[PDB]
């Protein structure tokens with residue numbers, strides 16, 4: 198009957214139903230949010246709402262994303278403290294209606310009376326897409342954002358730079374795309390799989406970026422760009438080897454392989470430093486959200502050990518751990534950002550491998566995205582007074598196989614990462630109440646070594662995405678896989694109407 202995903206914190210079914218009619222009147226940034234709602238509602242149902250049987254009141258004691266939704270025979274009442282809260286209330290309202298309403302599509306109207314009080318458990322409810330390995334483009338990204346918005350996810354992490362490609366136009370360094378965005382293989386080589394010789398790639402112009410930022414903002418999704426440095430940087434090194442390469446005498450090309458590249462940025466070169474600062478400057482212009490992800494995963498120190506300037510620099514900082522070069526590199530970038538005006542300042546996120554270095558050089562106002570040995574890494578981060586986001590490889594990497602069936606498309610894993618396994622992960626299990634404030638939230642990540650087709654992307658994304666979304670929103674004590682299964686089954690219709698692909702295993 199009522200199938201709400203994410204499951205609200207508190208839901209009480211009440212007497213009777215609220216009948217819309219064909220018109221009604223509403224008492225109300227908030228107006229613009231409601232305006233959007235009105236458009237979608239009219240599109241889907243034909244109901245017109247004039248500017249009262251619907252009231253939106255400001256309740257300043259509610260958290261930033263919280264709301265109350267009271268539906269009775271007489272009236273729909275909504276309370277929230279911020280625009281986002283009102284948006285989420287209206288998401289829930291739509292979800293109380295036939296699926297075509299959430300789909301925004303007319304088909305060939307009442308609400309059940311309810312009392313809802315709702316707030317997200319976590320402020321960070323994210324999805325990351327890797328477009329470095331395979332590029333999907335503007336239309337598909339809009340579809341991804343649409344999927345996220347359904348389940349009240351609010352953070353899109355854009356993994357735009359890799360060994361195998363660079364996907365964002367940087368004005369001051371045009372070769373990043375000219376070289377970095379194109380390569381002579383669609384598939385990425387691994388084991389017996391060899392490069393296929395086909396010219397393949399693509400990138401976003403700064404105009405494209407701004408359009409996608411705007412589109413997401415309308416659905417209260419903030420975009421975090423990732424420029425993954427100084428590892429996972431072979432494409433950038435291929436573009437500008439003279440100052441980025443540790444070994445600029447050697448050949449440097451965009452990588453056609455899967456795996457971990459040793460062709461990392463020369464963090465000791467001064468022009469490499471200037472490059473990074475100027476990239477960050479351009480990002481600051483395109484991305485208004487207050488966070489930047491600088492990566493820091495899987496960065497072999499091997500080439501630094503064979504580089505004279507790097508050996509010298511490591512000596513001057515008085516370290517025996519070549520990992521410290523990476524951390525010192527981040528320090529200079531962090532310091533640089535701190536000199537800029539307040540409105541141009543950005544907080545930094547890193548993958549948890551950065552904890553393997555002497556991080557006290559950086560300070561503790563960084564955010565750690567925990568992926569490998571994630572549970573332990575997050576605890577480690579929280580203990581050091583750092584904020585942390587949980588994105589464990591198992592089971593939050595939703596590019597991994599969701600089934601063992603021989604008919605599944607090719608991707609990583611052995612099919613153990615089922616909807617059930619994703620849902621059953623408990624982010625806060627055995628996490629001391631004193632550490633919990635540092636846990637900003639959760640994220641599903643999607644790596645695209647194997648995934649090249651939008652249809653396969655969607656197939657793997659859904660419905661596991663919704664499970665992570667619910668984990669991020671619904672308090673643990675209110676979560677239940679069997680209940681979730683029953684609720685998510687109702688979204689098959691929504692997916693069909695939207696023309697989204699999805700795994701059918703639990704449908």
Ligand SMILES: CC1=[NH+][C@H]2[C@@H](O1)O[C@H](COS(=O)(=O)[O-])[C@@H](O)[C@@H]2O
Nearest residue numbers: 494495548568590594596597609644
């Ligand atoms: C943060 C991070 N760095 C690595 C690591 O996660 O696994 C990804 C693939 O994971 S998967 O699909 O489970 O094998 C890989 O694409 C990425 O380069």
